[PDB]
Amino acid sequence: AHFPDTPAFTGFNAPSRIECDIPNLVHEGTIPPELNGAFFRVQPDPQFPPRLGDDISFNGDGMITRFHIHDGQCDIKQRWAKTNKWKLENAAGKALFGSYRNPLTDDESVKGEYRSTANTNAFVFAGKLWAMKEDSPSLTMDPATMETFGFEKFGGKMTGQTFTAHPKVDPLTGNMVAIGYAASGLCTDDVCLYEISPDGELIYEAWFKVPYYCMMHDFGVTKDYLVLHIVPSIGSWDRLEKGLPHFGFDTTLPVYLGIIPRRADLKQEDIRWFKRENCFASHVMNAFQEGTKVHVDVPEAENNMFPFFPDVHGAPFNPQQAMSRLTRWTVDMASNSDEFDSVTRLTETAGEFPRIDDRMTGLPYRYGWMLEMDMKRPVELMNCLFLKDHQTGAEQHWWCGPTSSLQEPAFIPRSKDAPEGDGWIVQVCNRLADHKSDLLIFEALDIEKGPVATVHLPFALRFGLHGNWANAEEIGLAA
Amino acid sequence: AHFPDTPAFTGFNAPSRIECDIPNLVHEGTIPPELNGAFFRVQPDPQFPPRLGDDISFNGDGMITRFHIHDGQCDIKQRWAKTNKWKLENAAGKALFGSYRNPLTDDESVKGEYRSTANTNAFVFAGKLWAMKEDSPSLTMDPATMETFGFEKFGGKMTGQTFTAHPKVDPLTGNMVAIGYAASGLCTDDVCLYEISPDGELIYEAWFKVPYYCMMHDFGVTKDYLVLHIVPSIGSWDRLEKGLPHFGFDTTLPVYLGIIPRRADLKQEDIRWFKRENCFASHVMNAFQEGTKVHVDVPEAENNMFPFFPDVHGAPFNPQQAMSRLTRWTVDMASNSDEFDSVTRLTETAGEFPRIDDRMTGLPYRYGWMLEMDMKRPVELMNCLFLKDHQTGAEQHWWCGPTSSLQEPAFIPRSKDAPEGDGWIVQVCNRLADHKSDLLIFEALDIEKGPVATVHLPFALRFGLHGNWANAEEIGLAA
Numbered sequence: 042a043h044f045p046d047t048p049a050f051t052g053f054n055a056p057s058r059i060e061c062d063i064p065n066l067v068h069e070g071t072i073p074p075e076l077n078g079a080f081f082r083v084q085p086d087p088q089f090p091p092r093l094g095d096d097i098s099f100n101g102d103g104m105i106t107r108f109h110i111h112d113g114q115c116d117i118k119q120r121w122a123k124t125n126k127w128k129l130e131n132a133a134g135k136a137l138f139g140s141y142r143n144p145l146t147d148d149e150s151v152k153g154e155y156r157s158t159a160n161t162n163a164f165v166f167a168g169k170l171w172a173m174k175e176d177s178p179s180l181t182m183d184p185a186t187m188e189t190f191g192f193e194k195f196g197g198k199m200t201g202q203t204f205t206a207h208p209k210v211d212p213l214t215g216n217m218v219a220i221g222y223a224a225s226g227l228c229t230d231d232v233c234l235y236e237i238s239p240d241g242e243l244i245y246e247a248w249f250k251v252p253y254y255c256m257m258h259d260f261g262v263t264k265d266y267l268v269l270h271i272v273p274s275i276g277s278w279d280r281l282e283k284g285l286p287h288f289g290f291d292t293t294l295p296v297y298l299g300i301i302p303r304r305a306d307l308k309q310e311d312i313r314w315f316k317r318e319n320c321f322a323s324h325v326m327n328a329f330q331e332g333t334k335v336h337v338d339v340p341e342a343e344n345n346m347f348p349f350f351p352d353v354h355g356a357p358f359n360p361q362q363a364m365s366r367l368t369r370w371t372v373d374m375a376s377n378s379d380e381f382d383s384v385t386r387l388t389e390t391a392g393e394f395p396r397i398d399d400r401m402t403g404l405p406y407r408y409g410w411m412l413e414m415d416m417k418r419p420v421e422l423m424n425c426l427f428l429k430d431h432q433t434g435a436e437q438h439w440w441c442g443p444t445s446s447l448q449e450p451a452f453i454p455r456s457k458d459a460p461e462g463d464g465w466i467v468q469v470c471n472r473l474a475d476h477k478s479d480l481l482i483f484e485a486l487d488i489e490k491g492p493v494a495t496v497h498l499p500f501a502l503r504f505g506l507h508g509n510w511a512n513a514e515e516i517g518l519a520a
Numbered sequence: 521a522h523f524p525d526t527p528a529f530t531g532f533n534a535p536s537r538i539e540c541d542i543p544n545l546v547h548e549g550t551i552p553p554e555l556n557g558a559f560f561r562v563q564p565d566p567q568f569p570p571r572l573g574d575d576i577s578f579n580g581d582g583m584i585t586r587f588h589i590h591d592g593q594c595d596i597k598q599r600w601a602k603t604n605k606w607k608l609e610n611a612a613g614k615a616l617f618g619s620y621r622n623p624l625t626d627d628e629s630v631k632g633e634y635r636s637t638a639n640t641n642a643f644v645f646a647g648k649l650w651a652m653k654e655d656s657p658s659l660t661m662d663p664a665t666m667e668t669f670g671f672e673k674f675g676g677k678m679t680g681q682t683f684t685a686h687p688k689v690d691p692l693t694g695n696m697v698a699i700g701y702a703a704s705g706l707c708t709d710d711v712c713l714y715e716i717s718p719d720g721e722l723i724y725e726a727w728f729k730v731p732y733y734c735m736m737h738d739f740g741v742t743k744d745y746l747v748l749h750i751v752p753s754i755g756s757w758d759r760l761e762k763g764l765p766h767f768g769f770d771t772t773l774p775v776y777l778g779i780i781p782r783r784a785d786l787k788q789e790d791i792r793w794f795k796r797e798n799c800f801a802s803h804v805m806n807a808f809q810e811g812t813k814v815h816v817d818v819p820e821a822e823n824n825m826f827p828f829f830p831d832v833h834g835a836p837f838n839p840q841q842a843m844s845r846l847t848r849w850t851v852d853m854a855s856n857s858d859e860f861d862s863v864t865r866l867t868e869t870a871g872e873f874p875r876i877d878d879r880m881t882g883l884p885y886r887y888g889w890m891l892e893m894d895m896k897r898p899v900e901l902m903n904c905l906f907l908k909d910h911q912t913g914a915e916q917h918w919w920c921g922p923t924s925s926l927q928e929p930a931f932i933p934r935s936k937d938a939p940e941g942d943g944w945i946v947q948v949c950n951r952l953a954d955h956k957s958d959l960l961i962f963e964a965l966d967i968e969k970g971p972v973a974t975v976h977l978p979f980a981l982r983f984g985l986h987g988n989w990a991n992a993e994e995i996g997l998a999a
């Protein structure tokens with residue numbers, strides 16, 4: 042394959058496309074013999090050169106990595122998420138879909154096809170692996186063999202056209218809670234709220250409208266509510282006609298937080314929109330209720346964090362204003378006005394990719410992990426694992442050294458009823474000087490001493506998005 | 521896996537064990553659209569940590585790489601050669617066989633098992649892939665799927681216990697010509713000569729004895745003769761009992777060249793042994809007859825080339841005396857004495873891994889390729905591809921640059937009846953600074969301009985041994 046000689050396709054961003062199997066990877070330290078399950082993660086990775094001759098990172102085809110940890114060893118299986126795009130392009134021997142979220146650039150042969158790359162999450166639910174991209178229904182896959190099933194529309198009961206890549210699991214029921222924005226077509230202001238039962242059946246789909254179409258990438262869930270931030274990374278057909286990146290950031294628009302009842306009978310008038318000044322947030326650590334209030338913890342930045350989705354008024358990217366710090370947004374459902382009850386920065390540590398012990402989804406919670414950017418460290422940039430204790434305020438940091446960077450952590454519980462945060466953190470480390478990757482395993486509440494085990498891969502993973510652990514019994518692997 | 525922190529298992533020698541599939545690898549330049557077939561090569565690569573806690577390179581399990589070149593692209597498939605050793609150790613979850621060519625160090629559970637790692641050649645013949653190790657019958661594999669069949673003993677017609685990893689194909693018949701040394705058991709002086717017809721049936725097996733047991737790694741074949749050099753890298757049960765490496769070099773023993781009739785009716789008295797002073801040679805570029813003479817071209821060194829098989833009298837390794845240069849050994853079957861007719865250095869270029877256009881096997885020939893060690897080049901060591909023209913004397917060199925090294929080249933003919941050397945050279949390049957490998961494709965008689973195509977692998981291969989091209993119709997791949 043002849044790929045462009047551009048930054049998105051070179052160096053750390055060289056196309057990989059490795060499908061492989063390796064058991065018993067070379068490792069150092071002690072892999073807890075308690076562990077029996079697998080960590081799934083996804084990397085965008087282009088099957089073919091892009092039609093335009095360049096592209097962005099968020100547009101590579103989804104390649105799924107599984108790290109099966111058992112018997113004190115770690116194995117790898119890596120396979121493509123075989124979306125309709127993947128299959129059509131594979132059969133044609135070339136790219137047929139064009140630029141990111143831009144159907145105007147697709148070959149005529151694939152008009153009316155799902156454009157999903159399934160490249161944003163590798164999530165386990167209802168005995169399936171969900172390879173997820175927020176512009177289409179989720180793909181599903183067999184978590185044991187990693188074969189692909191297809192797109193999931195729940196027996197026709199899902200009528201929305203899209204499904205999130207940030208599903209939540211409510212611990213009170215085991216339901217998956219999801220959204221789909223642009224639900225009636227590209228750039229529409231319609232959103233669906235979905236709840237799926239543990240058996241994988243759609244329970245309900247509820248439609249509503251938002252203040253403006255924008256990237257609704259993530260959200261929070263509480264017992265009673267969907268908690269939906271409205272942040273003006275906006276897109277439009279006009280942008281696409283003009284050849285611009287689908288999204289761009291508008292610093293002149295307000296930010297909202299919508300509190301939407303988790304109810305099949307939802308009506309637009311049931312929703313409360315709280316309003317604040319322009320800022321940027323993408324991911325949700327967790328949300329929870331307290332009295333008549335809703336709290337959501339997000340990495341908040343002063344301005345846009347996506348250089349590839351630029352300022353709509355032509356301003357150059359501002360890295361300093363893109364620094365994000367975990368911040369609690371609180372709204373009171375009993376309040377008179379639409380003002381937030383409070384906005385409170387929770388740490389001065391800059392970071393992103395927030396995670397919790399997912400058994401605390403929607404509940405008051407003590408611990409949060411993030412990828413941290415510590416710009417004071419020497420470097421030759423997400424260079425630390427960070428843990429925040431909301432009860433005491435305490436912070437832990439672990440630095441991966443001067444020639445490495447880190448990918449999103451994932452929490453592994455010791456047992457179903459173990460206390461919050463009792464378990465391990467796993468995360469990919471990019472060993473950039475060695476052009477390879479490690480899988481690191483930490484004691485989840487004692488990270489400063491470093492990983493208790495380091496699993497070496499004999500090749501490099503690419504930049505990853507989201508990932509998750511599941512125990513073996515949830516994914517068809519050996520007890 | 522916990523591997524030793526020793527040079528044989530670290531850095532470039534880190535265990536890989538990658539089984540993978542990647543079509544349409546990222547590449548630069550122009551892959552000739554004429555090419556339609558595959559290059560197979562083998563790397564020793566340990567499935568498990570060694571029993572002793574250290575080992576040597578020549579003892580890793582054989583991992584087979586196939587580069588399928590077609591339609592102007594290159595694909596990779598990499599799979600283990602599943603020897604009985606591989607299978608037994610895989611089932612046990614640990615190493616059971618011990619040190620190199622040393623049955624005394626094996627677990628009792630595998631007494632009486634073939635110790636083959638099938639790690640020395642990946643050769644195509646009779647519709648099969650032969651994964652070869654000279655201490656046992658060859659393994660065979662499906663060249664299309666790369667599944668393993670098992671060990672080949674030709675319907676019981678092979679009674680020798682071993683088979684070479686340097687088979688030759690006689691162009692006059694299409695027969696495979698092979699030897700097996702230590703044919704009646706470890707360290708014995710018995711050798712078999714075998715010829716196999718193009719259909720894969722054993723034609724004959726002929727037994728003879730050699731002046732002394734030694735590493736009989738390679739040999740030449742002419743129309744009438746097996747041409748067998750006797751070089752004193754010697755082994756013995758006593759060495760093994762004393763815990764020494766199986767082989768060690770004895771500078772006090774003479775070197776012989778045996779001329780053995782290619783005849784099922786061979787008797788010991790039919791053989792002529794020519795004798796010369798101590799020196800070292802391992803590989804054969806080619807052998808051929810002229811009148812009553814036999815010529816064989818070998819990389820000759822003054823002393824041992826294997827530091828891991830040390831001088832039997834305790835001398836430290838001498839790298840200067842290990843420099844090998846292509847040299848013609850000529851013997852006259854009509855001569856009165858046992859002296860060589862002549863020994864003539866053919867180049868001052870130092871190198872090894874000699875190859876020809878294999879359609880010239882056993883015949884007078886014009887071209888030879890080698891891996892060259894040019895110690896005058898900057899380096900931050902096999903660093904050049906070398907081509908010798910025996911007709912004009914001309915030499916070509918291509919240097920892979922200051923941070924790379926090269927593996928064995930293989931010649932690809934343009935067509936069955938194309939002239940000698942009309943075609944391409946393929947070879948793996950170790951891009952050590954990038955911890956990855958390239959496959960290089962050269963115009964076989966115009967190498968100084970560099971490769972016409974460079975195929976990037978998204979991972980590193982390990983040190984390789986021998987490899988071969990076959991056209992698609994010889995290996996079950998698409999026309």
Ligand SMILES: [Fe+3]
Nearest residue numbers: 258259324507
């Ligand atoms: Fe995300």
Ligand SMILES: [Fe+3]
Nearest residue numbers: 737738803986
């Ligand atoms: Fe050899």
